[PDB]
């Protein structure tokens, strides 16, 4: 079947030129609303989120983890990294490096976490280890944007990746302890008031992270708390067809704007 809200969907991603993918979960029932749930998207620095849950878990075990230092180098600076460069020839904790990874979208920080995790793989590994058999990091920084369609690398659905910010948020992948601070990371992302975020209610709360990369790729995955009722876990994904297309952030807003409006 063809829901309103999936026609809406459909006649945004139309106006749009792109390609949109849309997950929803309502935690309250469970139910489900999917736009192009099982086609792959890049992931761009929405990854960024498995990165550090994947370290969070890793912390569990060792207690001091989080305030372990790492080295920052004048060669591990990338394209964007405006907390890194200012450590370079200093170090950051790896608490530090999941709050840049996750609240500004710095990428030298993403790349630590990864070394972390023992390249692209232990995020992948990490992933399977939580029952998310779509999801794969195959690339560092800046490489894992490129967003070329077609390209497996660097992926994942909506369907996979709203089920896995749900288990890592709201349920038992992580601890306690480091489910509450991946949620007290992602409430306070610095990027995200264009993308998901304008589209819903004001009152409702949000913590998430946005994704930006070629082909004009603008994404964004959220939790959300709305005013009067459980929870909800949104993933919006859109890529477009030209290799250097503008963002389009608004176009998530819209996708948020329908979901609301479905509700
Ligand atoms: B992540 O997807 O947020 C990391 N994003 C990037 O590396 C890219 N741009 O990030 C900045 C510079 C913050 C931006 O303008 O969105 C990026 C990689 S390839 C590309 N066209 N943009």
Request: net charge neutral; aromatic share 4%; glycine share 8%.
């Amino acid at each position: 079947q063809t829901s309103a809200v999936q026609q809406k969907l459909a006649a945004l991603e139309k106006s749009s030129g792109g390609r949109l993918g849309v997950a929803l979960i309502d935690t309250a029932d469970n139910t489900q609303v999917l736009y192009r749930g099982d086609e792959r998207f890049p992931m761009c620095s929405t990854s960024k989120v498995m990165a550090a849950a994947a370290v969070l878990k890793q912390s569990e075990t060792q207690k001091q983890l989080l305030n372990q230092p790492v080295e920052i180098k004048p060669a591990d600076l990338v394209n964007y990294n405006p907390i890194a460069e200012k450590h370079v020839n200093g170090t950051m904790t790896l608490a530090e490096l999941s709050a840049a990874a996750l609240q500004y979208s710095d990428n030298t920080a993403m790349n630590k976490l990864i070394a972390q995790l023992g390249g692209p793989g232990g995020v992948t590994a990490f992933a399977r280890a939580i029952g998310d058999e779509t999801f794969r990091l195959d690339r560092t920084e800046p490489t894992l944007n490129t967003a070329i369609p077609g390209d497996p690398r660097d992926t994942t659905t909506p369907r996979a990746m709203a089920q896995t910010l749900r288990q890592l948020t709201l349920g038992h992948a992580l601890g306690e302890t480091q489910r509450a601070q991946l949620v007290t990371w992602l409430k306070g992302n610095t990027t995200g008031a264009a993308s998901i975020r304008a589209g819903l209610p004001t009152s409702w709360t949000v913590g998430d992270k946005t994704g930006s990369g070629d082909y004009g790729t603008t994404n964004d995955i959220a939790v959300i708390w709305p005013q009067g009722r459980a929870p909800l876990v949104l993933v919006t994904y859109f890529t477009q067809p030209q290799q250097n297309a503008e963002s389009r952030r608004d176009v998530l807003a819209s996708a948020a704007r329908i979901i609301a409006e479905g509700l």
